[PDB]
């Protein structure tokens, strides 16, 4: 809300760092399991695509105005895959990801970005 | 490891099937090399005996 | 082409033209074999049977470079007037190959 305000009514260049969205999806799994609701994959509810979409798609630039929103969500991939519903649906809504690798950080490389599973 | 779905179960069944064919393939290759080894061993002892006579 | 076979009967191999060396001591023969695999004596070394059964192990230790110097157990002359035991030599060659006492 503050990002959309400061970008589309006062013409700043807001960069948002959405830390660890897996906690947001855990909170949705809690509130979706307390409502006796249809699960998706691994117990997360049906509307998790819609809620991650209505967080993520509130970014970008508009026509005839000055501002900009740049979102960097941060994901903690649970078993460091692209098959869990949190990084999976995150990668479906968003436009590209930057994926970190356990091999390069064991080899001692910073930033350990393997470019093959990452795109923009 | 690999995160288990119904896709990776069939991919690992395919990898198992390829390795089970490869074991029999390499056993056939080892049989052909046994045949050529018992080919060459009598020729080697023949040439060795001719070397002994000379 | 070089030999390490005999003290005096290697002169017949020199009389063939092909060079060689003889010492009748195992370690100076192996040391001239060492300078013969360093300075490669044209790709063939023929070593006495009943002085070195396996010449190749020490040579592949002191030179893991390739097998251009080929190493053969060549027959001693005196034992050559006995009988070669061709059969038993191929027995030990096949057992050096696959370990089995299988007999072709």
From Swiss-Prot, chain A:
Signal peptide: none
Top-rank taxon: Bacteria
Designated gene of the protein: atpB
Coiled-coil segments: none
Protein name: V-type ATP synthase beta chain
Cysteine pairings via disulfide bonds: none
Stretch of the intact protein here: 240 to 359 of 478
Function as written in the Swiss-Prot or TrEMBL entry: Produces ATP from ADP in the presence of a proton gradient across the membrane. The V-type beta chain is a regulatory subunit.
UniProt record similarity statement: Belongs to the ATPase alpha/beta chains family.
Species this protein is from: Thermus thermophilus (strain ATCC 27634 / DSM 579 / HB8)
From Swiss-Prot, chain B:
Entry's family note: Belongs to the V-ATPase D subunit family.
Function summary: Produces ATP from ADP in the presence of a proton gradient across the membrane.
Name of the protein in its database record: V-type ATP synthase subunit D
Organism: Thermus thermophilus (strain ATCC 27634 / DSM 579 / HB8)
Phylogenetic placement of the source organism: Bacteria, Thermotogati, Deinococcota, Deinococci, Thermales
Full protein segment contained here: 3 to 56 of 223
UniProtKB/Swiss-Prot annotation, chain C:
TM annotation in the entry: none
Keyword Transport annotated: yes
Domain of life: Bacteria
GO terms of biological process kind: proton motive force-driven plasma membrane ATP synthesis
One Pfam family recorded for the sequence: ATP-synt_F
Gene3D superfamilies: 6.10.140.810, ATPase, V1 complex, subunit F
Sorted UniProt keywords: ATP synthesis, Hydrogen ion transport, Ion transport, Transport
InterPro entries: ATPase_V1-cplx_f_g_su, ATPase_V1-cplx_fsu_bac/arc, ATPase_V1_fsu_sf
GO molecular function, one term: proton-transporting ATP synthase activity, rotational mechanism
HAMAP family to which the protein is assigned, alphabetical: ATP_synth_F_arch (MF_00312)
Homology family: Belongs to the V-ATPase F subunit family.
Biological function: Produces ATP from ADP in the presence of a proton gradient across the membrane.
Protein name as annotated: V-type ATP synthase subunit F
Organism ancestry: Bacteria, Thermotogati, Deinococcota, Deinococci, Thermales
């Amino acid at each position: 809300t503050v990002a959309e305000y400061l970008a589309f009514e006062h013409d700043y260049h807001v960069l948002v760092i959405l830390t660890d969205m897996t906690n947001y999806c855990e909170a949705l799994r809690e509130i979706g399991a307390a409502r006796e609701e249809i699960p998706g994959r691994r117990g997360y509810p049906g509307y998790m695509y819609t809620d991650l979409a209505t967080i993520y798609e509130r970014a970008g630039v508009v026509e005839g105005k000055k501002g900009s929103v740049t979102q960097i969500p941060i994901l903690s991939m649970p078993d460091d895959d692209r098959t869990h519903p949190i990084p999976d649906l995150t990668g479906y809504i968003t436009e590209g990801q930057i994926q970190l690798s356990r091999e390069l950080h064991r080899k001692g490389i910073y930033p350990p970005i393997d470019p093959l599973p990452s795109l923009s | 490891q690999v995160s288990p779905t119904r896709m990776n179960l069939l991919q690992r069944r395919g990898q198992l099937r390829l390795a089970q064919k490869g074991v029999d393939l390499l056993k056939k290759k080892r049989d052909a090399l046994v045949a050529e080894f018992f080919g060459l061993v009598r020729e080697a002892m023949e040439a060795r005996k001719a070397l002994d006579q000379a | 082409m070089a030999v390490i076979a005999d003290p005096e009967t290697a002169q017949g191999f020199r009389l063939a033209g092909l060079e060689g060396y003889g010492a009748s001591s195992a370690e100076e023969a192996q040391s001239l074999l060492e300078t013969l695999v360093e300075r490669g004596g044209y790709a063939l070394v023929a070593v006495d049977e009943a002085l070195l059964p396996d010449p190749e192990r020490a040579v592949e230790r002191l030179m893991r470079g390739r097998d251009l110097p080929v190493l053969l157990p060549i027959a001693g002359l005196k034992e050559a007037f006995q009988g070669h035991d061709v059969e038993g030599y191929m027995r030990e060659l096949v057992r050096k190959t696959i370990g089995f006492d299988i007999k072709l």
